[PDB]
Amino acid sequence: APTFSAEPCCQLCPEAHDASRYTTRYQQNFTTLVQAQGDWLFRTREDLRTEFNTTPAGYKRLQQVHDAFKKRGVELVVVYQPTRGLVNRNMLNPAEKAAFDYQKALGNYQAMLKRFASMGYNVPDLSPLTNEQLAAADQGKDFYFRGDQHWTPYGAERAAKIVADTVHKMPAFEGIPRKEFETRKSGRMGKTGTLHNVAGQLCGTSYAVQYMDQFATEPKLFGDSGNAQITLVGTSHSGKNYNFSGFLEQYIGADVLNVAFPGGGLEGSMIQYLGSEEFQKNPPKILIWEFSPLYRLDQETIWRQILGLLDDGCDDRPALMSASTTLKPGKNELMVNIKDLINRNLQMDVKFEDPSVKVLQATLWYLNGRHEDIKLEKPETSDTDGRFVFQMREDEDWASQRLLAFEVQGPESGTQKVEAKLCKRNNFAV
Amino acid sequence: SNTLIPLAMLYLSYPQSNAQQQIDQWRAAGNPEAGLAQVLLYRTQGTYDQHLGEVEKICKAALNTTDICYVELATVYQKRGQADQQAALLGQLKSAYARGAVPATRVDSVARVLADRSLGQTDEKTAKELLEQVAPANPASWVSLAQLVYDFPELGDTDQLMAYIDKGREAEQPRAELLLGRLYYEGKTLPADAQKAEQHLQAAAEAGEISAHYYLGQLYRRGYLGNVEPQKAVDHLLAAARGGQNSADYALAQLFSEGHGIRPQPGNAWVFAQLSQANPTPQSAELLQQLDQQLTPDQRNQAQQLLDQEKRARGS
Ligand SMILES: [Cl-]
Ligand code: NI
Ligand code: NI
Ligand code: NI
Ligand code: NI
Ligand code: NI
Ligand code: NI
């Protein structure tokens, strides 16, 4: 006889619109949260941006990386994720839907894709997936999770179809063995989204878990396969949770070696793979690289490492100077130079005996006390190689400065074995 | 005669009248249904597990006149781990069913006793072999087989399980719809499919099973279909509770407390935690105390009003 009713709770509190409150570094990727239909939230600065550009130094580095891979015999397929705003604007509430300049953001996103294409990169055109309006039969299969930054598996599959179109038109795909695959629903996942968590602690509220289908891809006498000739480098977006590499195998029709891992960001997965012996003994014909507009494309310490690695660091090569030392806490002088060691012709290769070393903090000493302080950090979300490879600095006048010494900061306590070689670069050969 | 057993059922079912001494008089007087009556006394007073040896004596005496004792003996032998006596009993039961002396449903109930994990170590393979031999003459046992294979995947894959459910869904047993709903709900022998779950659970709930209501309530509460549906969750959980599922009440108290997309309402959570106390748990009373300390006296009084108005569920 008595009636008991229940209500859906909790529009974003007005206090989350206050940019003052996103103080920590983590919170800064969410500034600011806005409420949309259902419990869709959006981050204004990252999801609703209209600008997809980098600096000229960035474009020059991207061009060099393309050309260096090409000399190693690798073609690159750039998967440049369109934003949550670009794809799911139609879930916005009317006010934000009318303030978001989708035509400008669409044009600038397409322009950055064309820029990538201009440097030689193979660029699958993902703009047709923006302005998503799902068919009635696909009502719940949104490109993005409502309160999280990752695509759903359905978003990944849709991107994979276009990527496979690009790969089939590629001359490098010739000679790559073909293989059939079968992809099936395998289970269900529940996502507590990052946006919902940040919202929840800003407003003292609570969000429902969003459930989503998981998928799995299986290969369907001498029918076993050799080594992959396509490699996928990427972030958490390419991890097991969303089956991006499964869908790529399914629609390309070929094996795909997946070396992504969460927390790798723009360069972690790439740096770890380039240092690997898999890449140096079985370099792929096609490397698919997955990232998004979230990452600055003008960090010089990233590309000095990627370019050093594309030249194979310092091995199979005469050393100019070498060190085999036990670091102690404090400053440790590994090498002291006579010979005219010109920054623009040099690279450093540093391996720690202990593979758990994630940080290299060091100083390159030049004439009259001019010094470069370097700090290279490996991701803490994957087993990494304890190896740091980097070209000397070449911007401004640095390219001509002569190298005098190299020192390395020791551990807070204990001792650590390290080996360091200084060598000349070759021109990205074998 | 059907005389002493209904009379004992009367003397126990409403003690407005000793019963053990009346059974002892009927036994000392040598009336053959005395032992069945005292077994009934054991079951109703909750002492059955304390007198298993005498249950065996009585039913082994009465077995050839009272086939329900086939179920009783089996229970004893499952409780006390007696595989030898169980083999002998099942041999005489297969014989009796061959001779036409025992109906197929009695075989079905014995098989379901053999697979009752709550009795000790089960004999699920023997259960399957009995059910498969009486299923052609007793279609309900198809569903029994479907459930057996479900609890014991050892004995059959999902294709085998579905063959059983189809042979039984010819009789369109509502239990079959309930089993399909649970199969798509629980994601145990198959990947979970919330839509197929919802469909088969809806079929089951329209046909009788209030437990389908519990599952539908949980389904709308969590949002496995993609969205939480608060009112549907409340309605279906409430129907389950009003039908005799205790876990429903606690569920509702959780629903009105935890947020997670449903607006917390402390008073109604209170009502349902109190209802959940019928079979209390630590978590039950702990939620009840937190909620109670969260309310004001006027809120508490209005909540007591709904509580009393809901215990006014005639339900008979
Ligand atoms: Cl039973
Ligand atoms: Ni090219
Ligand atoms: Ni194609
Ligand atoms: Ni993840
Ligand atoms: Ni300094
Ligand atoms: Ni109730
Ligand atoms: Ni919670």
Query: For residues A360 and A373, what is the distance between their CA atoms, to the nearest angstrom?
Result: 10
Q: Which residues of A touch B (CB under 8 A)?
A: 1-2, 4-10, 38-39, 139-140, 185-188, 205-211
Find the catalytic residue in A66, A150, A196, A237. A150
Ligand that lies nearest to the alpha carbon of residue A370, given by its number in the listed order: 5
CB contact under 8 A, A211 and B226: yes
Query: For residues A406 and A420, what is the distance between their CA atoms, to the nearest angstrom?
Result: 10
Q: Is-contact A89 A97, C-beta < 8 A?
A: yes
Query: Ligand 2 centre and the CA of A74: distance in Å?
Result: 9
Residues 6+ apart with CB under 8 A from A341: A320, A402, A403, A422
User: Running DSSP on this structure, what letter comes out for residue B89?
Assistant: H
Ligand that lies nearest to the alpha carbon of residue A407, given by its number in the listed order: 5
**DSSP H or E run through A388:** strand A387-391
CB contact under 8 A, B264 and A211: no
Residues 6+ apart with CB under 8 A from B297: none
Look at phi and psi of residue A383 and say left if phi exceeds 0, alpha if psi is from -120 to 50, else beta.
beta
Contacts of B238 in chain A (CB under 8 A): 4
* Number of other CB atoms surrounding residue A169 within 10 Å: 9
Q: How far B232 CA lies from chain A's nearest CA (Å)? A: 9
Hey, is B80 helix, strand or coil?
coil
CB contact under 8 A, B263 and A8: yes
B265: nearest CA in chain A?
A6
Indicate if the alpha-carbon torsion angle A58, A111, A26, A232 is positive or negative: negative
B313: nearest CA in chain A?
A1
User: Running DSSP on this structure, what letter comes out for residue A8?
Assistant: B
Query: For residues A217 and A242, what is the distance between their CA atoms, to the nearest angstrom?
Result: 11
Structure tokens of B226?
A: 């993609």
Query: For residues A70 and A64, what is the distance between their CA atoms, to the nearest angstrom?
Result: 10
DSSP-assigned states of every residue in A299-355: -HHHHHHHHHHHTTTTSSS--SEEEEEEE-SSEEEEEE-----BGGGEEEEEEESST
* φ/ψ (deg, to 5) at B299: -60, -45
User: What is the spatial order of strands in the sheet that A286-291 belongs to?
Assistant: A75-80, A286-291, A230-233, A256-258
Q: Is-contact A392 A378, C-beta < 8 A?
A: no
Q: Is-contact B107 B115, C-beta < 8 A?
A: no
Which residue from A9, A188, A205 is facing B192, i.e. has the nearest CB? A188
Known active-site residue A168:
no
Query: For residues A288 and A258, what is the distance between their CA atoms, to the nearest angstrom?
Result: 10
- With the CA atoms of B126, B132, B138 and B139 taken in that order, what torsion angle do they form, in degrees rounded to the nearest 10? 120
How far is Cα of residue A344 from the mean position of the Cα atoms in its chain? 27
Indicate if the alpha-carbon torsion angle A349, A354, A359, A360 is positive or negative: negative
Contacts of B271 in chain A (CB under 8 A): 4
Known active-site residue A324:
no
Q: What separation in angstroms does the CA of A132 have from each of A33, A86, A162?
A: 21, 8, 15
Contacts of B265 in chain A (CB under 8 A): 6-7
Q: What are the E-state strand segments in A58-195?
A: 75-80, 182-191
Residue B174 one-letter amino acid: P
A140: nearest CA in chain B?
B226
DSSP-assigned states of every residue in B151-195: H-GGG--HHHHHHHHHHHHTTT-HHHHHHHHHHHHH-SSS---HH
Query: Ligand 3 centre and the CA of A82: distance in Å?
Result: 22
Look at phi and psi of residue A7 and say left if phi exceeds 0, alpha if psi is from -120 to 50, else beta.
beta
User: Running DSSP on this structure, what letter comes out for residue A413?
Assistant: S
Indicate if the alpha-carbon torsion angle B99, B105, B106, B108 is positive or negative: positive
Q: Is B292 exposed, middle or buried (0-12, 13-18, 19+ CB in 10 A)?
A: middle
Structure tokens of B284?
A: 């039950």
Contacts of B225 in chain A (CB under 8 A): 140, 211
User: Running DSSP on this structure, what letter comes out for residue B262?
Assistant: B
Q: What separation in angstroms does the CA of A212 have from each of A151, A187, B111?
A: 11, 9, 40
Ligand that lies nearest to the alpha carbon of residue A170, given by its number in the listed order: 2
Residue ranges of chain A assigned to CATH 2.60.120.1380: 313-424
Query: For residues A158 and B53, what is the distance between their CA atoms, to the nearest angstrom?
Result: 68
A185: nearest CA in chain B?
B191
B158 preceded by a cis bond (ω within 30 of 0)? no
Which residue from B227, B233, B310 is facing A2, i.e. has the nearest CB? B310
Query: For residues B56 and B63, what is the distance between their CA atoms, to the nearest angstrom?
Result: 10
**Side-chain half-sphere exposure of A233, counting CA atoms within 13 A:** 23
Structure tokens of A325?
A: 């030392």
Residues 6+ apart with CB under 8 A from B146: B161, B164, B165, B168, B176, B179
CB contact under 8 A, A6 and B234: yes
Indicate if the alpha-carbon torsion angle A384, A385, A388, A390 is positive or negative: negative
Residues 6+ apart with CB under 8 A from B257: B264, B266, B269, B287, B291
**Side-chain half-sphere exposure of A204, counting CA atoms within 13 A:** 3
* Number of other CB atoms surrounding residue B249 within 10 Å: 25
CB contact under 8 A, A6 and B265: yes
Query: For residues A118 and A93, what is the distance between their CA atoms, to the nearest angstrom?
Result: 37
Q: What separation in angstroms does the CA of B182 have from each of B178, B197, B211?
A: 6, 7, 10
Query: For residues B89 and B114, what is the distance between their CA atoms, to the nearest angstrom?
Result: 12
* φ/ψ (deg, to 5) at B171: -75, -5
Give the total number of structural domains in chain B: 1
Strand partners for A362? A374, A408
Residue B312 lies in domain: 1-316
Q: Is B246 exposed, middle or buried (0-12, 13-18, 19+ CB in 10 A)?
A: middle
Query: Ligand 3 centre and the CA of A165: distance in Å?
Result: 4
Query: For residues A40 and A33, what is the distance between their CA atoms, to the nearest angstrom?
Result: 10
* φ/ψ (deg, to 5) at A365: -100, 130
Q: What separation in angstroms does the CA of B310 have from each of B69, B124, B264, B271, B305?
A: 41, 42, 20, 9, 9
Q: What separation in angstroms does the CA of A342 have from each of A57, A88, A337?
A: 21, 51, 12
Query: Ligand 3 centre and the CA of A64: distance in Å?
Result: 30
Q: How far A6 CA lies from chain B's nearest CA (Å)? A: 5
Q: How far B307 CA lies from chain A's nearest CA (Å)? A: 9
Q: Could you tell me the fold of the domain covering A313-424?
A: Jelly Rolls (2.60.120)
**Side-chain half-sphere exposure of B80, counting CA atoms within 13 A:** 17
Query: For residues A377 and A301, what is the distance between their CA atoms, to the nearest angstrom?
Result: 10
Contacts of A208 in chain B (CB under 8 A): 222-223, 228, 260-261
Q: Is-contact A36 A96, C-beta < 8 A?
A: yes
Q: Where are the alpha helices (DSSP H) in chain B?
A: 4-13, 19-28, 34-45, 52-62, 68-79, 83-98, 104-114, 124-134, 140-151, 158-169, 174-186, 194-206, 211-222, 230-242, 246-255, 266-276, 282-294, 297-311
Hey, is A402 helix, strand or coil?
strand
Strand partners for A211? A190
Known active-site residue A150:
yes
Structure tokens of B229?
A: 């549906």
Contacts of B312 in chain A (CB under 8 A): 1
Query: For residues A207 and B165, what is the distance between their CA atoms, to the nearest angstrom?
Result: 38
Residues 6+ apart with CB under 8 A from B184: B190, B192, B193, B194, B196, B197, B200
Ligand that lies nearest to the alpha carbon of residue B78, given by its number in the listed order: 1
Find the catalytic residue in A47, A148, A312, A349. A148
Structure tokens of B262?
A: 């449903």
How far is Cα of residue B195 from the mean position of the Cα atoms in its chain? 26
B224: nearest CA in chain A?
A211
User: Running DSSP on this structure, what letter comes out for residue A28?
Assistant: G
Ligand that lies nearest to the alpha carbon of residue A4, given by its number in the listed order: 6
CB contact under 8 A, A185 and B191: yes
Query: For residues B173 and B139, what is the distance between their CA atoms, to the nearest angstrom?
Result: 9
Q: What separation in angstroms does the CA of A270 have from each of A147, A177, A259, A373, A430?
A: 28, 24, 8, 24, 18
Structure tokens of A29?
A: 């990727």
DSSP-assigned states of every residue in B204-241: HHHTT-THHHHHHHHHHHHTTTSS--HHHHHHHHHHHH
Contacts of A1 in chain B (CB under 8 A): 309-310, 312-313
Query: For residues A329 and A413, what is the distance between their CA atoms, to the nearest angstrom?
Result: 6
Query: For residues A80 and A289, what is the distance between their CA atoms, to the nearest angstrom?
Result: 8
Residues 6+ apart with CB under 8 A from A415: A326, A327, A328
Structure tokens of B81?
A: 């781990």
For Cα atoms A135, A138, A142, give the angle at the middle one, nearest 5 degrees. Answer: 100
* φ/ψ (deg, to 5) at B58: -60, -55
CB contact under 8 A, B191 and A211: no
**Side-chain half-sphere exposure of B286, counting CA atoms within 13 A:** 3
Contacts of B313 in chain A (CB under 8 A): 1
